[PDB]
Every structure is written in structure tokens, then in C-alpha cells.
């Protein structure tokens, strides 16, 4: 196979900002036919790849024009002019003049925005959910950045561990922010010996910890 | 209004075959290569294979040969790939792209339109449908957890996709048990909650599962 | 008299188009017209006066203007495939009652440029057997695999268009009949006397006007843009 | 409502072509016939405005208002006449079009001479038409019955300096099957025919 390598494998970049993804081939890319079919794709998260630049320097129409690429030989680049906060994703670079057609890591764009802390809510479980042996207590984290945040649990103020597991969604297209959602899972058993369920959030938007919580079990 | 519709998530055990279809409309089927591609979770693309429905012409990953078998179904403009032997590390999401070469043309070694993906699990553990609960309500948060499923993935949209703004489907926690776990949140006007009716609707294909959860303040 | 711009035009389906149109006999009337197989002609609308406009049989999907009395331009709003047609444009005095065309305007409209394939054009030189038999040598010329059907073919001798001796076919044939978006062929003869085919001087050349994108439209295939352009095949006299 | 009788007319050379109109509106008071030709605009030839015979070189339009009818004759039929013939009917300064007549004048061949022969192509001889010649307009050319051969329809040459006029169709195809001998081969022609052989290598 022909190996395609990227620099920088992350890039981070303030809006207004030009950036530029480096591609590099081990081999020569221009075909029997003189074209050279090195292209450039976006794959937003969640999506499938999109097509930026075809055949080195060539812009697929609907593009915008604030992206281009060059290269000749071995060594290919993908300039954006002026980043917008909707082009965040991973940057691939693609060969297809051998078979295998072959792609680049990938090079995650990240926009850098200004700090802005989370909008925490509490979920108890619901009663539907109850009947069946088991509880659910979420705590959502929304529009924050940085991707930075703590979430500790606590039930009558005990601090749990173990029993909560997390994930964050990607950048926003729109607002360069991130979301987190925490979920505490309990016995319906042991939920139902408590009062006081709480989740306490500690991030840089914060100057000192958020706390919502709930009575009720 | 070109469109690759590809078929549902699945799980198949190791050693087993699946077979992924890709439905093409909008546009002469014939005239269009259409490649393969794969990307393993959080992982990059590689590019499979492609088929020429017009002549049946196929190209290849050496990776793949010997697996890998690509058709077509000129009647119901559909291109199959199949692939045997499955191994652990087949689990994917398997796309389908449009090569942009129009009837025989060069462009067909760059793609313009892919499909939704595949997810393929390669696993020996059995499928189950979740069980979907509300998360009850200047502005206020409600949502859906959608809990104990397998495999990935599972589709939320809220108010059959009229409801988009605010909306964060956040990835999928594997739970001790085995079982995948998520949510789905929605921040809206709090001077709503009595007047706009909010239904999450949940699909889990691998198991036929379709769930529309009423969300209401308690 | 009346004037048409464009001759020819090709769209994709959602564009935009307005075909123009012109008088200088200081006529009120002006009307647009499209003409279909099967249906004659349809007026789609028309136009009293400067400043006044109506509808006509077929208004649907088009517009038009009159700010002065010798300008009606119809406008397409947004391109579909049953705008694919033929377009005349009329004038009447309207005060004598006589009606005077203008050359006409085909069109078509396409789900997408790719489909657009310019000529390709050879010549095949007088038989043998011809040259002997009859005293006359017939040229015929194929203008092959081009879409849309937007061509114009003329026969050149020394340099000099010619029309005596030559026929060319009123319809070209569709190379793929069963197919809509199917490419066409168009064939045409020149026939001239052996003792003038036969004299190494006389050049030949059957030259095809095609008309297809524009050297703005957007294009992502490895073969060339296929623009408005001339094709042409030639063939020299041969003393055999 | 304007109706024209049904078409195509074949009309010999030096015949006339025979072209009615009947109109619905019964107050109309001006009659016209446009000649078009294929792939050209509407062209005015003729108009009438009272009963009776109106002649412009080969052209007689009649007209009979009681009758709510027109007509067109074209004496002395040539060729060049043929084209689609539209009547309009109005009433004061709309124009009411017919859907056309069109009109086919077959030349007259005192001289047939019917041959297919073998043309090839000035940059490749591999390349290569047949053609179809010099037959009498009592011949018809079938249309392919093959899709991967393709055969145009009789056309009408006119050597004006000679005034010699000639009748051909040409057929061709990549079909390795293919022959000057086969091309015709759906269509009724001539049983003394010329085929002249295309000479090896
Ligand atoms: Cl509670
Ligand atoms: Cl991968
Ligand atoms: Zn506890
Ligand atoms: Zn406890
Ligand atoms: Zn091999």
C-alpha cells in the first residue's frame, strides 16, 4: 500500500484564523493517465466524509472557497483562508491512483473559543424505571468549554465512586461547545434508603463548584 | 436529490457473513461506481473495494480478497458487499460511496455522495432491545434515556426530526453487564412545558425496535 | 425583424434562464409561444403594449417583462425537464394582423451537466466503385454521441460553404432509443462529380457547431469541459 | 379551436400538395398559413381575409367563411416545399395555430440506379459507412431493428448545377457482424440492387 501521513494529527485554531493540514505520500501519486488523484475529506461527527478538494488543487463545487489545497510529488497541503466555527471534524487525505485507494490518520480541528461554564441539571430515575428493580439519577452538563469538567456524586452526602459512568459529545458545528452527561446507577433497594442525591461540577467557567440536586428514594 | 440508503445495523457471530446493502436513487444506477469504505470505532477510513454496476467490473483490497465479495442488483438500483470470516476487529461502520465519474469517467476515483453507514458488530453476545425512559423537565431540560441495549447503535430524534435545536445525543456507555446505555437531552423555552408536546423517538434496528416516549413535567 | 438570443441552451434542473427577445418594427404585440411534439403551439404569454402583460395558455413557471416596447424577455423562474422545448417569439403590429417569428429558442433541461457529450465528426471518403459506376463521388459525414441535440452542420469546400449537393438528415437518431438522456447520431452527404472529387486541390471539411456548457459552469470530470465549440473532420481530393 | 388535416402528405414532384384548416370561432375574420420548416420558425407564406381564391406563385389559399374552412394548394410540388404547413385563424389585432400538416415531396427519379457502397472514413479505414443510393422514391428505408446499428431515413440531395437530384440513407455500426450486404437487410429494396464488393485486406 501507498502510506499517507498527516501533520499535525491535531489542530487546534481560533475562528478568523487561517490553518493548514500537511499530507504526505511514500510515493509519487500521478497516474498512467497524468492526472494525480490526491483529495482532501471532512467527516463532521456523526456524518459521513464529505468531499472538500479533488485531484490536488481542484475545489468541489459547493465548497466554500476558503479552502484550497497544492502539492506535487510527495508532500500535499489543505489551507483554510479563514476557519469558521462550523469546520470542525477530522481532515482526511486521500490517494486513488493505486489500488488500495489509501487515507491519511485523520487530523481533528478544534476550534479555541472563550470559556464558557455548563448549565448542570439533575434527573432523578423515573418511576417507570423504579418498578423494575434499578435507578438511574442523570446529570447533564451543557454547553460548556473547555472539554474540561469534574462531576462527583453524592447521596446524603457521601461521595460515590464506581457506581457512574460518563461520556461527552463532540465540539458544536454552531457554539464550539461541549456536552456531558453523568449517570448514577443504584439498586432500586438502595435508592430507596436515601434523601439527598446531588452532582457537584467543577469546571473552569466555575470559580467555585456547582451543585444540583434532589430529595427523594 | 441523490440518496444511498443503506441497510440496518447488525451483530454477527465470529466466522460468520454479512451481507450490507446500499439502495441508490436520484441518479442513472449504471452510471456511477460504487466503493466501500469502513471505519472502525474512533478509528480512520479504509477503502474496501468498488463495483462498476454497468459491466460488473470489480477493484479491490488485497486485505479483503479472499472475504470481500461486491454485487450489484441493476432491477432494484442496489450494490451488496459481503464479507466472510468475520473477525473481531471487522466491527464497523461500513459506508458506501458514489465515484463522481459519470459513465466510465476518470472521476470515479473521488466520491460525492456516501450512505448513512452499517454498523457491523463482529460478537458472539445475543441482541436486546432497550427499555426507554423520560428525564422530566428562562429555560428547562427534559430528555429520554434509552438503557441496556446491544449492539450499537441506537437513533434518537425528537418530535419526528421537527425538533432539532438544543438537541445532544451523547455517545453510548458500555455498562458492566455488557449492555450499551445513552441519552438524549433537548434544552427548551420553559414557558412551554405545559403547551408543546416533546416525544423522543428511539430506533434500535438490530432488534426492531421502535419507541416513541412521551416527555412531560411531573 | 425579430431577434432570439439564445439560439440553443442547456440547463440543469433549479436554474435560472431568461431568453431575450427584440423588435425594431415598432409593433406593440409581442408574444412567447413554445412548441411541443404532438401539441402545436402554445402561447404562454403575451404582451398589448409597453407596460402590459398577460397570461396566456401555459403561464406556468414563466415570466416576462415589458419596460420597452422592443424588448419581451421570458424568464425562467426555476428550470424543470417539461421546460424542455422549443421557444418562438412572435410580434404583431396591432393597431395590419400578420405575425412575424423570430428564429426560436431549443432548450433543454437536464437532472445534471454530466449528461452533456459534445460531437464527434468523421468523414468517409467516395467509393470506388461510385466514382466508376455513377461519374458522381458522394462524401458523407457522422456527427456521433453528442447531448443535447444542439448541433448545426455545414458542409465547407475550399474554404466556401456549400448547400448544392448536400443533405443533411432533418432529425438525428438516438443512439440508445429505449434511454431518455440517450446521446444522438446526425449523418449528412455531399455529393459533387468524380472529375471534382478527384482533383488534389479540393479540400472538404464538414464541420459541426455544438452547443453545451459555458466556460463559467462547473465541471468535475477528467474529460474536457464539454462547451459550445466547433467540431470538424476534413477530407482532400484524391486522384486515385 | 383550429384542425388540419392528417399527416405526412407524400406528394409526388410536379403534383399538388392538398392542405385543409377548419376553424371553430365563427366571427373570425383573418386567415393565415405559416410554412416551417425542420428545426426552423414558423414563416407567414399566405393570408386571406374574404371568399374566394387568393394565388401567390404556387400558392392558391381558398377560403369559405360558411363553411368555416381554408385551404392551401401547392402546385408543382418540389422537395424543397417540404416542410409542416400551420394554419391561424383569429378575428382582430389572438392568432389560433393548428397543430401542422406536414408535407413530403418525393423527387422524381427518371433514372434510378439503386447500389449500397462502402465508404471509409478519411483518417482510419477500419472506419466505415454504407450507403444507400440512387433508388426511386417507390423505395422506403426500414428503420434498425438491432440497437447497436444505426440507419437514417431517405434524404433528398439536389445537384443544382445538374440538376440532377438523388436519394440516400446511410447505416452504420461497430458490430462485428456488420456488412454493406446485411445493413438493408430490414427493408424492401430494389431486387436488382448494385453491390459492389469492398475489396480484401
Ligand atoms: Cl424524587
Ligand atoms: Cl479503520
Ligand atoms: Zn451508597
Ligand atoms: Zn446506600
Ligand atoms: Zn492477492
Known amino acids: 500500500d501507498i502510506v499517507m501521513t498527516q501533520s499535525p494529527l491535531s489542530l487546534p485554531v481560533t475562528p478568523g484564523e487561517p490553518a493548514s493540514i500537511s499530507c504526505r505520500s511514500s510515493?509519487?501519486?500521478?497516474?498512467?493517465?497524468?492526472?494525480?488523484?490526491l483529495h482532501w475529506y471532512l467527516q463532521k461527527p456523526g456524518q459521513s466524509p464529505r468531499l472538500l478538494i479533488y485531484?490536488?488543487?481542484n475545489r468541489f463545487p459547493g465548497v466554500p472557497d476558503r479552502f484550497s489545497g497544492s502539492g506535487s510529488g510527495t508532500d500535499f497541503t489543505l489551507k483554510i483562508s479563514r476557519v469558521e466555527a462550523e469546520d470542525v471534524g477530522v481532515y482526511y487525505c486521500?490517494?486513488?491512483?493505486?489500488?488500495?485507494?489509501?487515507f491519511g490518520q485523520g487530523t481533528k480541528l478544534e476550534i479555541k473559543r472563550t470559556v464558557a461554564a455548563p448549565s448542570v441539571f439533575i434527573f432523578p430515575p423515573s418511576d417507570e424505571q423504579l418498578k423494575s428493580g434499578t435507578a438511574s439519577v442523570v446529570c447533564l452538563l451543557n454547553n460548556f468549554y473547555p472539554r474540561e469538567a469534574k462531576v462527583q456524586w453524592k447521596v446524603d452526602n457521601a461521595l460515590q465512586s464506581g457506581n457512574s459512568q460518563e461520556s461527552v459529545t463532540e465540539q458544536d458545528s454552531k457554539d464550539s461547545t461541549y456536552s456531558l452527561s453523568s449517570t448514577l446507577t443504584l439498586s432500586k433497594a438502595d435508592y430507596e434508603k436515601h434523601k439527598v442525591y446531588a452532582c457537584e461540577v467543577t469546571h473552569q467557567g466555575l470559580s467555585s463548584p456547582v451543585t444540583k440536586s434532589f430529595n427523594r428514594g | 436529490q441523490v440518496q444511498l440508503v443503506q441497510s440496518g445495523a447488525e451483530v454477527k457471530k465470529p466466522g460468520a457473513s454479512v451481507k450490507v446493502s446500499c439502495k441508490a436513487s436520484?441518479?442513472?444506477?449504471?452510471?456511477?461506481?460504487m466503493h466501500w469504505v469502513r471505519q472502525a470505532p474512533g478509528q480512520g477510513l479504509e477503502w474496501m473495494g468498488f463495483?462498476?454496476?454497468?459491466?460488473?467490473?470489480?477493484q479491490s483490497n488485497e486485505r479483503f480478497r479472499g472475504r470481500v465479495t461486491m454485487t450489484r442488483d441493476t432491477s432494484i438500483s442496489t450494490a451488496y458487499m459481503e464479507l466472510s470470516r468475520l473477525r473481531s476487529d471487522d466491527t464497523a461502520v461500513y459506508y458506501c460511496?458514489?465515484?463522481?465519474?459519470?459513465?466510465?469517467?476518470?472521476?470515479?476515483?473521488?466520491?460525492?455522495?456516501w450512505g448513512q453507514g452499517t454498523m457491523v458488530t463482529v460478537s458472539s453476545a445475543s441482541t436486546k432491545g432497550p427499555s426507554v425512559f423520560p428525564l422530566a423537565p428562562g429555560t428547562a431540560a427534559l430528555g429520554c434515556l434509552v438503557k441496556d441495549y446491544f449492539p450499537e447503535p441506537v437513533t434518537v430524534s425528537w418530535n419526528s426530526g421537527a425538533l432539532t435545536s438544543g438537541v445532544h445525543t451523547f455517545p453510548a456507555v458500555l455498562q458492566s453487564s455488557g449492555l450499551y446505555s445513552l441519552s438524549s437531552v433537548v434544552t427548551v423555552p420553559s414557558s412551554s412545558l405545559g403547551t408543546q408536546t416533546y416525544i423522543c423517538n428511539v430506533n434500535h434496528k438490530p432488534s426492531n425496535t421502535k419507541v416513541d416516549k412521551k416527555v412531560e413535567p411531573k | 425583424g425579430v431577434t432570439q438570443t439564445p439560439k440553443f441552451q442547456v440547463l440543469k434542473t433549479g436554474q435560472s434562464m431568461t431568453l431575450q427577445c427584440a423588435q425594431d418594427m415598432n409593433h406593440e404585440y409581442m408574444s412567447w409561444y413554445r412548441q411541443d411534439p404532438g401539441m402545436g403551439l402554445r402561447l404562454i404569454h403575451y404582451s398589448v403594449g409597453a407596460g402590459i402583460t398577460d397570461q396566456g395558455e401555459v403561464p406556468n413557471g414563466y415570466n416576462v417583462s415589458r419596460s420597452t416596447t422592443e424588448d419581451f424577455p421570458l424568464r425562467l423562474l426555476s428550470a424543470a425537464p417539461s421546460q424542455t422545448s422549443v421557444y418562438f417569439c412572435a410580434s404583431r403590429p396591432g393597431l395590419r394582423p400578420e405575425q412575424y417569428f423570430g428564429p426560436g429558442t431549443r432548450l433543454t433541461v437536464t437532472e445534471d451537466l454530466k449528461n452533456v457529450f459534445p460531437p464527434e465528426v468523421a468523414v468517409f471518403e467516395p467509393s470506388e466503385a461510385e466514382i466508376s459506376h455513377t461519374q458522381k463521388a458522394t462524401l458523407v459525414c457522422l456527427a456521433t454521441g453528442f447531448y443535447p441535440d444542439h448541433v448545426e452542420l455545414s458542409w465547407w469546400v475550399n474554404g466556401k460553404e456549400v448547400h448544392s449537393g448536400v443533405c443533411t438528415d432533418p432529425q438525428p437518431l438516438k443512439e440508445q432509443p429505449a434511454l431518455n438522456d440517450s446521446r444522438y447520431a446526425l449523418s449528412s452527404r455531399l455529393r459533387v462529380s468524380a472529375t471534382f472529387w478527384q482533383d488534389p486541390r479540393n479540400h472538404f471539411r464538414c464541420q459541426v457547431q455544438f452547443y453545451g456548457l459555458s466556460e463559467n459552469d462547473e465541471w468535475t470530470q477528467d474529460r474536457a469541459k464539454p462547451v459550445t465549440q466547433i467540431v470538424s473532420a476534413e477530407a482532400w481530393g484524391r486522384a486515385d | 379551436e383550429v384542425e388540419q388535416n392528417s399527416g405526412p402528405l407524400s406528394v409526388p414532384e410536379g403534383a399538388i400538395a392538398s392542405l385543409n384548416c377548419t376553424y371553430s370561432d365563427r366571427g373570425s375574420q383573418s386567415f393565415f398559413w405559416y410554412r416551417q420548416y425542420s428545426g426552423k420558425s414558423p414563416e407567414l407564406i399566405m393570408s386571406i381575409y374574404s371568399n374566394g381564391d387568393k394565388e401567390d406563385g404556387r400558392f392558391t389559399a381558398q377560403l369559405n367563411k360558411a363553411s368555416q374552412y381554408v385551404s392551401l394548394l401547392i402546385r408543382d410540388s418540389q422537395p424543397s416545399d417540404s416542410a409542416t404547413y400551420l394554419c391561424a385563424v383569429t378575428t382582430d389585432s389572438k392568432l389560433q395555430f393548428g397543430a401542422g400538416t406536414q408535407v413530403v415531396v418525393t423527387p422524381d427519379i427518371q433514372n434510378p440506379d439503386p447500389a449500397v457502397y462502402q465508404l471509409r472514413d478519411s483518417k482510419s479505414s477500419d472506419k466505415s459507412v454504407c450507403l444507400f443510393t440512387d433508388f426511386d422514391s417507390q423505395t422506403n428505408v426500414s428503420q434498425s431493428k438491432d440497437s447497436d446499428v444505426y440507419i437514417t431515413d431517405k434524404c433528398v440531395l439536389d445537384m443544382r448545377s445538374m440538376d440532377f437530384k438523388s436519394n440516400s440513407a446511410v447505416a452504420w455500426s461497430n458490430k462485428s457482424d456488420f456488412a454493406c450486404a446485411n445493413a438493408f437487410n430490414n427493408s424492401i429494396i430494389p431486387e436488382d440492387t448494385f453491390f459492389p464488393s469492398p475489396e480484401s485486406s
Open positions: 460511496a458514489r465515484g463522481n465519474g459519470y459513465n466510465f469517467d476518470g472521476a470515479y476515483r473521488f466520491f460525492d455522495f
Open positions: 436520484g441518479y442513472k444506477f449504471t452510471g456511477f461506481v
Open positions: 463495483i462498476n454496476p454497468y459491466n460488473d467490473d470489480i
Open positions: 510515493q509519487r501519486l500521478v497516474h498512467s493517465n497524468g492526472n494525480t488523484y
Open positions: 485531484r490536488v488543487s
Open positions: 486521500s490517494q486513488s491512483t493505486h489500488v488500495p485507494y489509501t
